[PDB]
């Protein structure tokens, strides 16, 4: 539950590393292992986490 996170976020432009920082900016300490299930396998809830880190990080 590591490179599945990488594999999920590389669609956007995040390389998991910048996503990682933006998780803390969101204040949601996630994708640590076994969210990464949802990252690939539940793309509905994946898009929610991404949405929160998108405002918190990217578009902030």
Curated annotation (Swiss-Prot):
Name of the molecule in the record: Large ribosomal subunit protein bL20
Which GO molecular function annotations are given, in alphabetical order?
rRNA binding; structural constituent of ribosome
The keyword Cell membrane is annotated on this UniProt entry: no
Question: What keywords tag this UniProt record?
Answer: Ribonucleoprotein, Ribosomal protein, RNA-binding, rRNA-binding
What does this protein's UniProt record list under function? Binds directly to 23S ribosomal RNA and is necessary for the in vitro assembly process of the 50S ribosomal subunit. It is not involved in the protein synthesizing functions of that subunit.
Task: Please provide the Gene Ontology terms (biological process) for this protein.
Answer: ribosomal large subunit assembly; translation
* Protein's organism: Aquifex aeolicus (strain VF5)
Q: What family does this belong to? A: Belongs to the bacterial ribosomal protein bL20 family.
Residues of the whole record sequence present: 59 to 118 of 118
Q: Would you say which domain of life the source belongs to?
A: Bacteria
Q: Does the keyword Ribosomal protein apply?
A: yes
Recorded GO CC terms: cytosolic large ribosomal subunit
